[PDB]
């Protein structure tokens, strides 16, 4: 039967109980999902509190891990998503994301009601990707994919 | 010689007095940028208080929007960037941006240090696009790649 | 072409200009949907700045409160959305329905993934009615139907 | 004789083991409701700190959970109610009825003065229902019913 | 046919100009009431813009005050209600109303729980009313009733 | 010698434990202060962490609530006053004390200046009363009078 | 007979008005409370929003500083108080009187029920004053005195 | 070498051990700093987390309180100074502070701007004591005394 | 006479008619700032209304910018100072400034007390300053130098 | 394999008992970084939880603080970083930081436009360094310098 959680604390202190263990591991986030079936962003945000791992999934990172049985339980929780501690990061890696909505927001708006029309991009229906690759001037970049599905709104 | 805004206001004010011209003449973002050698969402971004147009495209889009002098003027001011009314969107639309922080930012911060290590994605080198795909299995999906260089944090 | 708002106090100033013109006219919000071919909430909610009037409708409403061009053009432009002043209602009226999400936030999250699964219910696609039904205790009591549509997470 | 709480957490914390509890056993929120007379909503509602629970259902929630008798006791108190963390949802589920008040507040303000006059729709003289209907166009649809009583605010 | 309100800044803004009124008239708030068959804190609420006068009281001040024929059918309109500028008084006066909570809310709380039950007294099934009498020890006091109805909250 | 507290945290944990004892025993607010000389509402605030016992009614509430040492000696304390978790309550109950203020804030201060003049209504020099009296139309009526002394603001 | 004001924006108006007058006419505020037999401190006050003027006063500064007779008026009415823009200064000089209560608040309230008791130090019934005095290190220092009434708070 | 903290909790936990020694063995703050050399107000002020002792006093008070080396130690470093739980206090004690400054804080700016010039009064170079003193009208009066540095800003 | 402000909005307004003046006539700061004997960053603050202009400096930018009496005389008012709009920027440049607080902020801290003892590096006695350099790597360096002077925090 | 957090409570509290341990040898931040190759503010900044120290210099600072391997490992995490308890700094120290970006904020970004162009001074690409200097007119001054690169954004 499906189980939620509803304080994410629960779930966000696992969470560091988790990278503790891969630290002492020396584990990375794609060895922990290699072998799951499942994305290497859709687990890593699991561990992370913000996703739920089906059973097996749960169980071949809990022996990964070495989690016990009420943390690899907890991983199958839906969760109570929200990973920003207090709605602006001050983290300098995640606050850069929170720039482009300043920065970009009103254009993605605009943008989305041109090329698609009233409605949004859903946050729910996703798959999400990051890869590096060689910048041409030098250096290195990101490519992240955020793949989401257009739901109008129309009248009633 | 370069001259730059310190009070939003002014430029979102602006942003207003556009979008009510360009509903009036029924132009789309597109066909605003077309001929000034930029991308729409510079062109637009700009439009909306968030970039600076050079004199020349600031002297197309405002023959085209039937713009003043000071307006044109203002489009070449480097913003005072900050799109969001108060800190978190109500917008719907804009919101999902936002959510997409509250879900994955953790993991964006864990997968950009294990891919590319301490630092970050800068969104000032970067450039964002939204793509209209057909869902193969009806409606439409929007990918939104995101781009940025990595920029490294070392020791010194 | 689709026309898009960025600021929401050029429509919350229209609005409280149409609730000015509807007050002298003596209008009810039933009467000003009436002949729309729409419901009653989503052409209200279209005065007040949160909807999209199509452009017959716009023309219809328009008629009715001697509402110049540009206000009709207006209320054909996807808002940017959001209701509320600062945050929390400070209106009694609206303020029942914010504490209704103190109170029972968090089991309509659990019964939601009881009855649906991980995911949530779409406020984007839609359907809002008030109905006033007689209270068998003496008075009345509202029936406010929320028709939404489950929109599943599922790993990737 | 009557209890009451002064500080949610105590009551939160429950939650949290009472959720911990259910989901080892794997039971439903409809099942633990099973026997008590009471509607699932409101049962759901004070495992999780909103609600007081009648001396026999805290009894009989209590052996179905394997509670201890302090806990079986504290489900009893009159709750410090208040659900969300911190005023706005992190949780998409939950954030959805957030987003439904900025949309629809002020329409939901105005539709209720027209139909009832001027005063509230009260959300303790109130019920919450969720039932799943399946969408005629593929999917499945969630209808929330909110029935609260009104409440006239009249001169004096 | 009844008439709402959704931004207080209109109602708020004519507070201020039937404030300057009454001070060049050197009327009280006592004789802006008196002949209206209303309470003096009813009718002074309703010039500052958080409650509606029935038509008869709204054109009797009207002409006392010298408003305009906008100003009294704003009257008329049911307000959207908030008096505090941003949530916590600065002003001394308002603010020990505020301490007042800060002190003893939850000892309110616990109180009306043990002689009324569970539930609320509703801050609108109201009255209102300020008296100054002598203080005994010396000097003068406040007794302020706030007359309204016990609203149970009860298992369903 | 007089002692003061600077976190409230201290009393209010004590608040619960002794929230709880009083439940487990199941005891009144009125029972706890029958014996004592002191009021039913001093006596209840200063358990909730909002006033201070003399010794001997510390001694004997910690008798009847099966209290230790440092907690006896703790009631004793002034303390850092201020129940309100977050200021702004999500407790229905204390929030319609709340909703006073906000609906009849700028009321109070108008009548306040115009029965005393300028000053305030302390806050300190006070006592709070709640009586039930039956409504004449079916259910109870909750008069809270509030008493405090005038306190003028004069030039200097 | 007494008027009084609920906004503060009317009297921060004046004041701004007031300041640039003043600028204009090069005058102190030493010598623009001469002759109104009120201390400097509660005059400045006064004209900045935070004390009423009695009208002999109001009519004598109104003379120095040419404000016509709706200005005049509005001195003598009892203000909103809250000269803080949002609740915290940015100004450095009246940040300087916020840190000291960071700094030492809690020795304040320490001292205070030492020295007196529980209860307050009114900031009604209180006095201020700045004075330069010379420093023997080199340099000057202002002795600020706060002069205020101990209020206490007793059982009963 | 001197040594300095980060996180103000470490000494605000400090703070309240200190408390409950304090209470337990009946002193007052003026016996604590007796035989130290500093003033009650600086030796108060550290305990409670806000300034730094020296050494020889904090063996002093150590001794007195019945610390551990430890709490000596913490005593001995420089705070991360902020007393103020959540930047507005709550506490009615320490509320009257920043009421002073809501209703002073710009006549404080204009009049140091008048006696000295443009800079600040120093919250640093900052020595402050409270007195008592019978009032003449009864009932005894609080004057603090804030003496602090003048530092000008002048242009560079 | 020395004058001063106490409401931003005034000199932050002066400060956008400012920035249309250098626009339209395309000056730079330090043309500006040319002739004053002022460094740039102080005249620039001035503009933005962040300091003083001694009266000959002010009439010398105010012939260059064909201000009129009232704003000349504006620029020598002691501002009311804060630039940002509300606490932390929203914009990227000025931004970096702050994360650089958050980074650093009790780094700062921690070798401020190793390296000169107990107190502050003051912002009064404070000039910063904004130097271009090449980066042998390619592109330019910009080195930001803050020099502040040590005050000295000492028991009393 | 790389390691990163996302909850700054663990490299906080980690940071307290560094400091603890430190002040228990009598440590510097000088001799702590002394012969790991690393500049002083990088140092210290890890140990505060701001920077990831490599393996080595882990190992070394470890053993001059007495760390367990937990400890060591810890300091080799990519941190959360965020060092501001809530957003504003408490600490007069930390506070005169953001002092700095009040009153030159917006100078710094036009400064930085004219001089560099539009975009941002990284504020990643770092070196900082605080020097103690002698002030010339007596007494210390602190020299902070603040090393980043230039980074443009540019029309696309
Ligand atoms: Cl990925
Ligand atoms: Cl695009
Ligand atoms: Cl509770
Ligand atoms: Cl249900
Ligand atoms: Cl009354
Ligand atoms: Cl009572
Ligand atoms: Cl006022
Ligand atoms: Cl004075
Ligand atoms: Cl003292
Ligand atoms: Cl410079």
Request: charged share 15%; no cysteine.
């Given at each position: 039967m499906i189980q939620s959680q509803i304080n994410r604390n629960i779930r966000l202190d696992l969470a560091d109980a988790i990278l503790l263990s891969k630290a002492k591991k020396d584990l990375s986030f794609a060895e922990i999902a290699?072998?799951?079936?499942?994305?290497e962003a859709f687990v890593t945000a699991a561990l992370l509190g913000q996703q739920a791992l089906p059973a097996d999934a749960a169980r071949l990172v809990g022996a990964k891990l070495d989690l016990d049985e009420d943390s690899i339980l907890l991983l199958q929780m839906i969760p109570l998503r929200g990973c920003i501690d207090d709605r602006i990061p001050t983290d300098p890696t995640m606050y850069r994301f929170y720039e482009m909505l300043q920065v970009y927001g009103t254009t993605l708006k605009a943008l989305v009601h041109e090329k698609f029309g009233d409605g949004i991009i859903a946050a729910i229906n996703f798959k999400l990707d990051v890869k590096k690759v060689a910048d041409p001037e030098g250096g290195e970049r990101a490519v992240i994919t955020l793949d989401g599905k257009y739901l109008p709104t129309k009248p009633f």
């Open positions: 290699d072998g799951t079936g499942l994305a």
